[PDB]
Design a binder for these strands. Structure first.
Ligand SMILES: [Mg+2]
Ligand SMILES: [Mg+2]
Ligand SMILES: [Mg+2]
Ligand SMILES: [Mg+2]
Ligand SMILES: [Mg+2]
Ligand SMILES: [Mg+2]
Ligand SMILES: [Mg+2]
Ligand SMILES: [Mg+2]
Ligand SMILES: [Mg+2]
Ligand SMILES: [Mg+2]
Ligand SMILES: [Mg+2]
Ligand SMILES: [Mg+2]
Ligand SMILES: [Mg+2]
Ligand SMILES: [Mg+2]
Ligand SMILES: [Mg+2]
Ligand SMILES: [Mg+2]
Ligand SMILES: [Mg+2]
Ligand SMILES: [Mg+2]
Ligand SMILES: [Mg+2]
Ligand SMILES: [Mg+2]
Ligand SMILES: [Mg+2]
Ligand SMILES: [Mg+2]
Ligand SMILES: [Mg+2]
Ligand SMILES: [Mg+2]
Ligand SMILES: [Mg+2]
Ligand SMILES: [Mg+2]
Ligand SMILES: [Mg+2]
Ligand SMILES: [Mg+2]
Ligand SMILES: [Mg+2]
Ligand SMILES: [Mg+2]
Ligand SMILES: [Mg+2]
Ligand SMILES: [Mg+2]
Ligand SMILES: [Mg+2]
Ligand SMILES: [Mg+2]
Ligand SMILES: [Mg+2]
Ligand SMILES: [Mg+2]
Ligand SMILES: [Mg+2]
Ligand SMILES: [Mg+2]
Ligand SMILES: [Mg+2]
Ligand SMILES: [Mg+2]
Ligand SMILES: [Mg+2]
Ligand SMILES: [Mg+2]
Ligand SMILES: [Mg+2]
Ligand SMILES: [Mg+2]
Ligand SMILES: [Mg+2]
Ligand SMILES: [Mg+2]
Ligand SMILES: [Mg+2]
Ligand SMILES: [Mg+2]
Ligand SMILES: [Mg+2]
Ligand SMILES: [Mg+2]
Ligand SMILES: [Mg+2]
Ligand SMILES: [Mg+2]
Ligand SMILES: [Mg+2]
Ligand SMILES: [Mg+2]
Ligand SMILES: [Mg+2]
Ligand SMILES: [Mg+2]
Ligand SMILES: [Mg+2]
Ligand SMILES: [Mg+2]
Ligand SMILES: [Mg+2]
Ligand SMILES: [Mg+2]
Ligand SMILES: [Mg+2]
Ligand SMILES: [Mg+2]
Ligand SMILES: [Mg+2]
Ligand SMILES: [Mg+2]
Ligand SMILES: [Mg+2]
Ligand SMILES: [Mg+2]
Ligand SMILES: [Mg+2]
Ligand SMILES: [Mg+2]
Ligand SMILES: [Mg+2]
Ligand SMILES: [Mg+2]
Ligand SMILES: [Mg+2]
Ligand SMILES: [Mg+2]
Ligand SMILES: [Mg+2]
Ligand SMILES: [Mg+2]
Ligand SMILES: [Mg+2]
Ligand SMILES: [Mg+2]
Ligand SMILES: [Mg+2]
Ligand SMILES: [Mg+2]
Ligand SMILES: [Mg+2]
Ligand SMILES: [Mg+2]
Ligand SMILES: [Mg+2]
Ligand SMILES: [Mg+2]
Ligand SMILES: [Mg+2]
Ligand SMILES: [Mg+2]
Lengths: 123, 119, 114, 56, 209
RNA sequence: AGGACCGAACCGACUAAUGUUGAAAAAUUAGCGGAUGACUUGUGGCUGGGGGUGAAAGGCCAAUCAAACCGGGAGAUAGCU
RNA sequence: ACACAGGUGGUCAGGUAGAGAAUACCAAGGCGCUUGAGAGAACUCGGGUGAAGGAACUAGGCAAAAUGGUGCCGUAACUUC
RNA sequence: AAUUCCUUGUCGGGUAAGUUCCGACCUGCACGAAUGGCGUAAUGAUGGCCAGGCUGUCUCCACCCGAGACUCAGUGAAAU
RNA sequence: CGAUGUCGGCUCAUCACAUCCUGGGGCUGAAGUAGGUCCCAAGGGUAUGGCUGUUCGCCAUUUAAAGUGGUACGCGAGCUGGGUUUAGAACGUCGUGAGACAGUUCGGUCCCUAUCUGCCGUGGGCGCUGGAGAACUGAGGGGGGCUGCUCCUAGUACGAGAGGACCGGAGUGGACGCAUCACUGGUGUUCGGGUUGUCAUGCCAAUGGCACUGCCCGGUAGCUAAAUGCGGAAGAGAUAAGUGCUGAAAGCAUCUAAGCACGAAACUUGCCCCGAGAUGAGUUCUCCCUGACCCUUUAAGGGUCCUGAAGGAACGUUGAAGACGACGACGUUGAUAGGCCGGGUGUGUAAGCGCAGCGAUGCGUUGAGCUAACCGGUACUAAUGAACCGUGAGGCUUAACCU
């Protein structure tokens, strides 16, 4: 359940460590973003020599939330870290190539089939 | 709104409500009939009638529960030694409400509450 | 009521092994992808149990890949396929929410042996 | 927060149209003591539905 | 098309084979008993009048019990009336089972909603709280401004204000029927119908095709 | 040792809510400042209105102060209402 | 102006916890603050809790929240040392 | 600049984005040396700005405890 | 000018259309994609932040779009008090000076219990031409009306390629609204436990009081959203702009003059709710009442006694009903409430006793004990015999029947 000004965490080897959501995408007045969603972020903190850099503005895809997802049985898969995976602004596809931590079954699509392939654990 | 709720508030906060019924239930059993207002009388039933329900089993535990409900040794005695064997075959309903009209000073609806087998 | 319970009793799975909080448990759930019903395992600590008969459910917490994953299975759901107690434990409080901040050493719970 | 005219006393009667009281309809005559009392209330002598219930 | 009168038993869930948890609402529907057939020639419009349930025989009034005895049917807890579509007719004492819904796919459920008492504008019309701090004097939940300065110098009809909320008739449309358990007289509909447990419901088939 | 520090009484009065025909013609509540000193307080005493007094704001001088209060000239005058 | 949530100088100094006349529960002692009875809507006042986020609110982090004790360790620029 | 009219000066930093801020520039409308100049540690219920922390301030409000409101009895105002 | 008290924000709006988005067209220097402009069209929709008091502006980043205006530059007897606009103070400037500056800066009291209209609700009264109880019709009145994206059609038409459709269909989102509490959660000062200080129950033990519910940890019902169901339509009719057919006036031509077809989120329907106080007071069904008399200025009259129906209301127990009223369920033939029994839930293994242990404590008895609003039962208590109200066949005029 991500809104603006939300600090997130980085789930790959892209280079950032701490980002912040600035815009939920996919519709006017869209309050919240769960998993499988594209948000615009800045970068608060990165490694000293990474593919991205402090102050870059780019998209991301949300993979782990604290509020968790739901399932058609009524089950629910929470986490502890509101974490995301960075994306290109144009090709709209991940930047780093080593996904950290698990992801969920809702993430898979033709859009994000690469990310679940690089993920260690698809719940 | 208060849908499906229970209990009364009686224009008193919760520590006073619990302390008042404690003082009242002991004052009931000491006299077996008292005069009070009707909403206080309809609510006292949901205190004393579980105490009489507890009076049907003289364990040392129920001694310790009923003293924790009342804090009065004399009431603890009169419950188990007398009211135990008195109401010993009644499926609840140990008390009775009798309405004596209205109070003089403030028009409050007064009612007598008594135990059933007082006579 | 007598009608609702009559409908819950015809969908409860009777074969649920009983357990308590603080029981390390492993759960096999069905995962369908393509036309493949693989049977994914999942294993962790029961930290909360909500009992309402048919609607009864429980919460399992594990630490996967440095991340704490809670997951709450509807008990009588047909997507869970097997529940197996691995390690019973001796906890005292009925819901173990303080295991959302104790990690590693303090996350350990001692084994019930009775 | 205040009137701009004196409201007429004809309005004051109309405002007090619903302020009339209401007489007690039924008085139970006690079948034993004979005295009249409020239905579902006890008498003034401790009778209720015939029998003596409280020695006052 | 005609509908059926039911009572809201409560909400539960039905798992499918595929692990889909469908939150159903249990509406029992007892044997609806037609009391009177209206038409054009005496009444101007074709409709039936049905009853359901049973009632205390020493409760029903001689005007009301005389109406049931005219039909020759057992007295129910209330009467309801359903507009016939054409080519759809019934006799007087004919009963109706819940097997009418045995082939439908969506239904429409009309019931009296719950009553939330005297509700403020925040709860009723979904206004906004004002600033809960920064010096708000006595105005944390009020509706603010209600009109304009003098030129429409009044307050308009149907302005959203405080007041009564709920306890009124509503209808939830196109609910999905799940199961018609005709033997124990149940009806399983996906989603939540209005009204409290045990209130009366009017269940018609889908009006939108 | 200290116009030292923290902090009660005491003395204050920064913010906020309340109150605004109040409980109150300036207060309560919750936080706040000083608290061995240029501190605070009690009893008595002096300074009188263009005067007093003022770590000064035209402050304060009996709920009133760019001139107190009370009597008088005085039924001041009023091209205004 | 009141049987008014204000003001009013001095003297007394119990117990336990506690540095303490803090504060908490108590002692001696003194009260229950002179309309009540119900109800448990809006709304207001005074409060308690909060999913996910954490100043995005807003003139302004106002207010709330949070911090808080003792002992020990460790402690930057700067400096009138 | 507590002073700059133009003016949100320009440049730099800061922010995703800065009419504020901080640092340069001097084009000082109209600084400037006891109606003091420029520094200045400490100090401040001081002004502006930033960060962390925390949180119903907010998204977006929910629920609860009381005191009122409300009904009944007694009393019984006010401005206009 | 015997006061119409103010900028901006907030909260609620409402209207216009000079249309921002969506809809439909015409033309294009319109290949397609895109535009461009014009015409019809107000139905709904019509961002969030950074800056500063802003209005305005600029910027970021979205969106289909981030419309323009009116409404005392809408809205302080609704809030705010930043700006401006008092008294303090200071700078620059001006003035010999007091002071002054649409110059700047720091600081700076926002009252009002609603009488009427208005409105939101909800009652009482009476009417509706005998009374009563229900059920409706619908004269009307409100509400509702948004849109993205993907895929198919199809890399098709197109195009030199780049690129890339119409139309039609499926799917899925955003926002909003209604409902609901089964799920997920929140709350749950009445349930349960832990624990601090202290005091008390003779003491130990066990409890309890107070300390913001002492502090915490969980949490039932209910209520709730962030939880999850549903909705916006399709269609009809009649149209706007526009497109036509036939077709003269006017041997031709012509969408029109006769006639005829089509034509949009607009119109009227269709959907939802209110809805016979629709005074024009509607309709249907059921039930109830079949007394004597006197009196006159014979009347739809006055009085007397008789009679008291259907039913109603009061009362009482009450409610997922509720400010009060109302509404609903029930009043012994009775499960209405409380209690009780059973279950269930939650808490998590009571007390007591035994053991172990110097002890703190641990183990056993023991998933124990406790358990609010739940569930299913139960007349144990309280829902009185009643009384009260409402009556006595329902004016007149024609008409049609019927005798
Ligand atoms: Mg109840
Ligand atoms: Mg006047
Ligand atoms: Mg009145
Ligand atoms: Mg209700
Ligand atoms: Mg808001
Ligand atoms: Mg105020
Ligand atoms: Mg307030
Ligand atoms: Mg106004
Ligand atoms: Mg007008
Ligand atoms: Mg000092
Ligand atoms: Mg204070
Ligand atoms: Mg000090
Ligand atoms: Mg003198
Ligand atoms: Mg003075
Ligand atoms: Mg003078
Ligand atoms: Mg003078
Ligand atoms: Mg004089
Ligand atoms: Mg004169
Ligand atoms: Mg007094
Ligand atoms: Mg006093
Ligand atoms: Mg002392
Ligand atoms: Mg008093
Ligand atoms: Mg009261
Ligand atoms: Mg809170
Ligand atoms: Mg709690
Ligand atoms: Mg929170
Ligand atoms: Mg949290
Ligand atoms: Mg900022
Ligand atoms: Mg903002
Ligand atoms: Mg801001
Ligand atoms: Mg600002
Ligand atoms: Mg603060
Ligand atoms: Mg606090
Ligand atoms: Mg400037
Ligand atoms: Mg710069
Ligand atoms: Mg200059
Ligand atoms: Mg010089
Ligand atoms: Mg000089
Ligand atoms: Mg100078
Ligand atoms: Mg100087
Ligand atoms: Mg309250
Ligand atoms: Mg004027
Ligand atoms: Mg005037
Ligand atoms: Mg005015
Ligand atoms: Mg137009
Ligand atoms: Mg066009
Ligand atoms: Mg050309
Ligand atoms: Mg329109
Ligand atoms: Mg339309
Ligand atoms: Mg619109
Ligand atoms: Mg902005
Ligand atoms: Mg406008
Ligand atoms: Mg205006
Ligand atoms: Mg103002
Ligand atoms: Mg100001
Ligand atoms: Mg001055
Ligand atoms: Mg000045
Ligand atoms: Mg000069
Ligand atoms: Mg000026
Ligand atoms: Mg009426
Ligand atoms: Mg409409
Ligand atoms: Mg719920
Ligand atoms: Mg529930
Ligand atoms: Mg919960
Ligand atoms: Mg709950
Ligand atoms: Mg203690
Ligand atoms: Mg002890
Ligand atoms: Mg005490
Ligand atoms: Mg307390
Ligand atoms: Mg809790
Ligand atoms: Mg249509
Ligand atoms: Mg047409
Ligand atoms: Mg045309
Ligand atoms: Mg032709
Ligand atoms: Mg021709
Ligand atoms: Mg549409
Ligand atoms: Mg029975
Ligand atoms: Mg009972
Ligand atoms: Mg039970
Ligand atoms: Mg249990
Ligand atoms: Mg034990
Ligand atoms: Mg205990
Ligand atoms: Mg055991
Ligand atoms: Mg039961």
């Amino acid at each position: 359940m991500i809104q603006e000004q939300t600090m997130l965490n980085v789930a790959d080897n892209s280079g950032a460590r701490r980002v912040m959501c600035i815009k939920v995408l996919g519709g006017s007045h869209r309050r919240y973003a769960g998993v499988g969603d594209i948000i615009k972020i800045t970068i608060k903190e990165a490694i000293p020599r990474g593919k991205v850099k402090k102050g870059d503005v780019l998209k991301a895809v949300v993979v782990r939330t604290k509020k968790g997802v739901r399932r058609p049985d009524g089950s629910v898969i929470r986490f502890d870290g509101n974490a995301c995976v960075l994306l290109n602004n144009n090709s709209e596809q991940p930047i780093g190539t080593r996904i950290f931590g698990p992801v969920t079954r809702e993430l898979r699509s033709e859009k994000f089939m690469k990310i679940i392939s690089l993920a260690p654990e698809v719940l | 709104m208060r849908h499906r709720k229970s209990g009364r508030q009686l224009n008193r906060n919760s520590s006073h409500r619990q302390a008042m019924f404690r003082n009242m239930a002991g004052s009931l059993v000491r006299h077996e009939i008292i005069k009070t207002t009707l909403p206080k009388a309809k609510e006292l039933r949901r205190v004393v009638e579980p105490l009489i329900t507890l009076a049907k089993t003289d364990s040392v535990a129920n001694r310790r529960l009923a003293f924790a409900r009342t804090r009065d040794n004399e009431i603890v005695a009169k419950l188990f030694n007398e009211l135990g064997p008195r109401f010993a075959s009644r499926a609840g309903g140990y008390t009775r409400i009798l309405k004596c009209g209205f109070r003089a000073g403030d028009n409050a609806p007064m009612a007598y509450i008594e135990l059933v087998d007082r006579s | 009521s007598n009608i609702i319970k009559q409908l819950e009793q015809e969908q409860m799975k009777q074969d649920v092994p009983s357990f308590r909080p603080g029981d390390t448990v492993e759960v096999k759930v069905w995962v369908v992808e393509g036309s493949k019903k693989r049977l994914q395992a999942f294993e962790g600590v029961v930290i909360a149990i909500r009992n309402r008969g048919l609607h009864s459910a429980f919460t399992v917490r594990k630490i996967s890949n440095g991340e704490g994953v809670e997951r709450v299975f509807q008990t009588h759901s047909p997507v869970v396929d097997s529940i197996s107690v691995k390690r019973r434990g001796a906890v005292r409080k009925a819901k173990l929410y303080y295991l959302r901040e104790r990690t590693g050493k303090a996350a350990r719970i001692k084994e019930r042996l009775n | 927060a205040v009137q701009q005219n004196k409201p007429t006393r004809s309005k004051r009667g109309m405002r007090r149209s619903h302020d009339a009281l209401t007489a007690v309809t039924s008085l139970s005559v006690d079948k034993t003591s004979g005295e009249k009392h409020l239905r579902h209330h006890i008498t003034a002598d401790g009778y209720y539905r015939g029998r003596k219930v409280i020695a006052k | 098309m005609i509908g059926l009168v039911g009572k809201k038993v409560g909400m539960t869930r039905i798992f499918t084979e595929d692990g889909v948890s469908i939150p159903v609402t249990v509406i029992e529907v007892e044997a609806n008993r037609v009391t009177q057939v209206k038409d054009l020639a005496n009444d101007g419009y074709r409709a039936i009048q049905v009853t359901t349930g049973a009632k205390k025989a020493n409760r029903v009034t001689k005007p009301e019990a005389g109406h049931f005895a005219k039909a020759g049917v057992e007295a129910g807890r209330g009467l309801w009336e359903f507009r016939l579509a054409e080519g759809e007719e019934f006799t007087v004492g004919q009963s109706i089972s819940v097997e009418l819904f045995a082939d439908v796919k969506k239904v429409d459920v009309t019931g009296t909603s719950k009553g939330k008492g005297f509700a403020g504008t925040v709860k009723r019309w979904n206004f906004r709280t004002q600033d809960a701090t920064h010096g708000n004097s006595l105005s944390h939940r009020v509706p603010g401004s209600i009109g304009q300065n003098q030129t429409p110098g009044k307050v308009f009809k149907g302005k959203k204000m405080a007041g009564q909320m709920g306890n009124e008739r509503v209808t939830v449309q196109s609910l999905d029927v799940v199961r018609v358990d005709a033997e124990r007289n149940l009806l399983l509909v996906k989603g939540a119908v209005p009204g409290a447990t045990g209130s009366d419901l009017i269940v018609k088939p889908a009006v939108k095709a």
